[PDB]
Design a protein around this nucleic acid. Structure first.
Lengths: 64, 65
RNA sequence: CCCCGAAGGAUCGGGG
RNA sequence: CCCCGAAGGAUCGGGG
């Protein structure tokens, strides 16, 4: 699980790591799947959790 | 053009890839689009969440099985 | 409730 | 600010 705070209007982008083997990934999902939990909301700040095979990159949008 | 659904503290979303979509085809769609996650709005107890993703992926609120 | 941070895979960290 | 919906790909619909 990875945890980041977003406000209204802020996003999160899920590329997939360039290196990892193509087929490799696909099974982990057909089995695993990606999990998006909204672990706690407070005032203006949503606090999200993301759980994803290690071949997916997760970046807050403001990281280019 | 993405998918909108409200969640509360502790509520989730699970992203499946449709069982019929080809293995090799999906990859193409992420390689060129990624999957995006906007928090469109926050109001009180409920978070409003936008998710943009290739028809290859099934977006379901965690409480539908 | 604010504020600030977070290249972080952790249900993140720090301040009023 | 609440309520309740939402198998829905649409920055979702309904009531105070």
């Amino acid at each position: 699980f990875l945890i980041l705070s977003r406000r209204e209007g802020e996003g999160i982008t899920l590329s997939l790591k360039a290196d990892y083997p193509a087929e490799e990934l696909i099974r982990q999902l057909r089995e695993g799947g990606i999990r998006i939990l909204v672990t706690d909301i407070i005032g203006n700040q949503a606090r999200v959790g993301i759980e994803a095979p290690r071949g997916v990159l997760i970046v807050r949008d403001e990281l280019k």
